[model samples]
Target: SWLSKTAKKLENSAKKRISEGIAIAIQGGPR
Candidate 1:
């Protein structure tokens, strides 16, 4: 479904951002 695809895209983007945040924090980088 179109909605499901959109949701998946958002979820993937959110997860990527979360992982990136963790990486940055571990390296004493930006918020």
Candidate 2:
């Protein structure tokens, strides 16, 4: 009921955003 809707909503969305940091950092770090 509580997290159920929240989880679904978050899952439907992008979840992690690049605004937090660099793309590589957000992904798997330097290659």
List model 2 lDDT by residue over 1-31, tens digit each.
1223345445632344433455667588654
Cα deviation at 29, candidate 1, in Å, is: 7.4
lDDT of 1: 0.56
Highest lDDT model number: 1
Clashing pairs in 2: none
lDDT for each candidate structure = 0.56, 0.46
lDDT tens digits, residue span 1-31, model 1: 1223344445744655567668878789654
Model 1 lowest lDDT segment of ten: 1-10
Candidate 2 stretches with Cα past 4 Å from truth are 1-21, 29-31
Query: TM-score winner among the candidates?
Result: 1
